[PDB]
Amino acid sequence: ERVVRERMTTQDVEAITPQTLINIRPVVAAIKEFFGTSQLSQFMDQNNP
Amino acid sequence: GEYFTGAMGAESIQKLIENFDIDAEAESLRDVIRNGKGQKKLRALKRLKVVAAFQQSGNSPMGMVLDAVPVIPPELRPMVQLDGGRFATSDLNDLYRRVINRNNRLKRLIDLGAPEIIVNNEKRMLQESVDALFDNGRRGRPVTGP
Amino acid sequence: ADLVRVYLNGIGKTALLNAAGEVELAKRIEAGLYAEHLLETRKRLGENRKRDLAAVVRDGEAARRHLLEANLRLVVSLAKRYTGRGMPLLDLIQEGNLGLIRAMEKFDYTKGFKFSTYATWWIRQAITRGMADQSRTIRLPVHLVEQVNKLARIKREMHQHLGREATDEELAAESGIPIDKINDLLEHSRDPVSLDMPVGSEEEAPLGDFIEDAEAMSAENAVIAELLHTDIRSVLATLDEREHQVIRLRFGLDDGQPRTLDQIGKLFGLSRERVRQIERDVMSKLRHGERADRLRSYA
Amino acid sequence: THIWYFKGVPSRLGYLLDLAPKDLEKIIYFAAYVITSVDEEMRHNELST
Amino acid sequence: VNFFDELRIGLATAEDIRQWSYGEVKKPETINYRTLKPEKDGLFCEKIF
DNA sequence: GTATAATGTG
Incomplete structure (x- = not known):
């Protein structure tokens, strides 16, 4: 949202569409980082059920 | 500007310490300590112990103000290639690069000649660079890359 | 502390200048440099001319000092934009100061353009070249740095257009650079x-x-x-x-x-x-x- | 200057040089000038003049 | 061989650094990007280290 | 090497 608000403050207002206004990179990056390095996302130990 | 000479920066402290005489100050502070004034006596005693430590040494206090920093051998700060061509190096290289760049830029500014404001800013940056090299967090905001 | 704060307090000690002020400063610098050239060029050294040229040299030094100090703040304004990359803010500010010093020795008052017009180009050039030269541990050729930045910009543009991170094949198609050189550049664009x-x-x-x-x-x-x-x-x-x-x-x-x-x-x-x-x-x-x-x- | 001295507690530079820590930190980072020396002998001999 | 009576620590001076160093580092380059060799006068130069 | 014009962080 920070990136989006900066972009809409700078980008032209005539031919603007939300498709060119959203930036999906940070959210996917955050999700992947959480699932990869977060200390609460651990390998499921599978010695037995 | 014909009698008194003064300047700002670490060079000024170098000059001041060079002009300062340790033995004479030690004798005067011993004279002061010989009196009472307990409130000021503790501070006088701490200063006296430091000054006497310098006095008995036979060396000079100028060693505190550096004019040439050393660099450890590269094996102590190795730069190795990990599998996949992903280089790995110690932050000592980054700190030394900062110091070298600041020093070279300072030399370039002095050679070219510029108003004293920019030169003073460059000298301050170099001082901060050396400070960050010798210790991080010992003064001010620590540097962080990642 | 806050060396940035002390520098920004010092930089504002002088106020900006209007068109006429800059024009007269350029005239004074021109006269100073002319006197400097004549002082050593003349085969016969005039006596009163010696004193006049000494005073003119002092005035020219003062004029260059005044112009640089007045126009410094443009350096901070331009440097603030490039932050977030490898080098800190003060390093970029010093790079821009060097660029401004380079530019000031070429300014002309006959053109009539404002000084910032001819200063911004050189400030940006100096800042970008310094960042390319002294911002990475393993120094790379300037052209290779430019190619790496081009690859990054192409990838970001493709992501913006298609809404998803561009594939390697599509990156090669859009940029035209084969996948081999693209992989080389990607390998050259990772902090150790x-x-x-x-x-x-x-x-x-x-x-x-x-x-x-x-x-x-x-x-x-x-x-x-x-x-x-x-x-x-x-x-x-x-x-x-x-x-x-x-x-x-x-x-x-x-x-x-x-x-x-x-x-x-x-x-x-x-x-x-x-x-x-x-x-x-x-x-x-x-x-x-x-x-x-x-x-x-x-x- | 070596960081270990003008920043340590006690600051050996401050104790030896009888300068308060605030003044020392200001002087090191090019904040305020300092009068290193003065021709006191000439001033005294020329005190009348 | 291994006759170490004492081990003292002193405050190094500029001349000590000068005379206990086998070269001067005059450029910031560490290693060449393509040939993977130390660069002249760099932090890894063979001439120095 | 550049000339609309820009003139103090985060």
């Missing part, structure tokens, strides 16, 4: 990992602690190599001593300098064609008897 970073939470021992020397194997050079050398000094010596010297000079066991067939023949007085048969005899001998028993390993 710091060895002091804790690894595996294994007592937070740094990565540097787990890197093998990768060379100088103890046992290999300790026993195997030296014992091979000694057994060779025994075996090759057990051959004809003349042939032992021939081998020493042929490969360079003692003094390097592997003697070619013709050279060794000249040294021994023999012909270039004999050395092939000599080597054939040596290799035949080395492959039989206790020599093979000793030297079957090491291959």
